[PDB]
Amino acid sequence: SMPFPKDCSQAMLNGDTTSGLYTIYLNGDKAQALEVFCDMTSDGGGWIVFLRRKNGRENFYQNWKAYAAGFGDRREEFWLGLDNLNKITAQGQYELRVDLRDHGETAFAVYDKFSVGDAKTRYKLKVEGYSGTAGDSMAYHNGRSFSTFDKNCALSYKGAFWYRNCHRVNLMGRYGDNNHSQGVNWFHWKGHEHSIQFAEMKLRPSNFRNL
Numbered sequence: 001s002m003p004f005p006k007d008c009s010q011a012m013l014n015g016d017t018t019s020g021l022y023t024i025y026l027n028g029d030k031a032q033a034l035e036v037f038c039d040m041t042s043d044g045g046g047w048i049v050f051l052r053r054k055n056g057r058e059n060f061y062q063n064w065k066a067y068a069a070g071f072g073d074r075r076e077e078f079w080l081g082l083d084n085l086n087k088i089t090a091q092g093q094y095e096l097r098v099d100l101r102d103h104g105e106t107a108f109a110v111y112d113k114f115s116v117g118d119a120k121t122r123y124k125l126k127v128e129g130y131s132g133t134a135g136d137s138m139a140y141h142n143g144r145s146f147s148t149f150d151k152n153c154a155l156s157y158k159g160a161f162w163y164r165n166c167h168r169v170n171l172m173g174r175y176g177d178n179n180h181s182q183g184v185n186w187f188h189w190k191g192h193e194h195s196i197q198f199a200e201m202k203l204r205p206s207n208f209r210n211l
């Protein structure tokens with residue numbers, strides 16, 4: 001095993017094959033411990049989950065400092081934090097996976113290249129290299145800074161995202177809200193008038209597929 005695994009891929013190769021909470025260490029530094037949820041089953045596992053929607057119990061209409069730091073219950077609905085995402089994606093070349101489920105239907109999106117810039121970039125999104133079944137709804141968002149109501153799409157849709165004008169993805173939107181663009185949306189799968197029951201966003205090294 002590795003003593004200070006820097007993501008869920010290094011924690012999995014540590015032979016831990018059960019999904020759940022694991023400690024990772026940013027840059028492999030024992031002083032930068034972070035508790036994460038590892039999805040060890042989806043497409044080979046080793047995924048850090050950074051967003052989960054499943055029941056509408058958690059409030060996602062939260063401010064910049066909350067989106068920077070992270071919030072929620074890692075075992076249920078939560079947001080990992082933009083500072084964490086910046087520090088993880090800085091460690092190497094990461095891939096994004098999005099898993100969606102609604103009334104028994106599932107879809108997914110993978111982006112071969114995924115990064116989140118630091119606070120001086122207002123946590124700029126990079127997403128490239130789409131494959132999957134959900135439809136490429138992140139392309140619209142590529143290169144955009146993060147937006148919250150206090151730093152306006154976040155206000156208009158009462159959510160937070162790498163908003164443009166405004167969204168094709170709104171996975172931090174209002175749970176079960178089928179009103180146009182208000183809900184947990186992935187436009188090129190279920191449009192803007194259908195809030196998705198279950199959503200996870202997760203990341204791991206892009207080279208994991210053949211390591």
Ligand SMILES: Cc1nccn1Cc1cccc(C#N)c1
Nearest residue numbers: 069070071072073074078079080
């Ligand atoms: C540890 C801590 N103190 C304040 C904010 N955070 C970050 C946080 C909170 C809840 C869930 C996640 C995840 N994943 C991250």
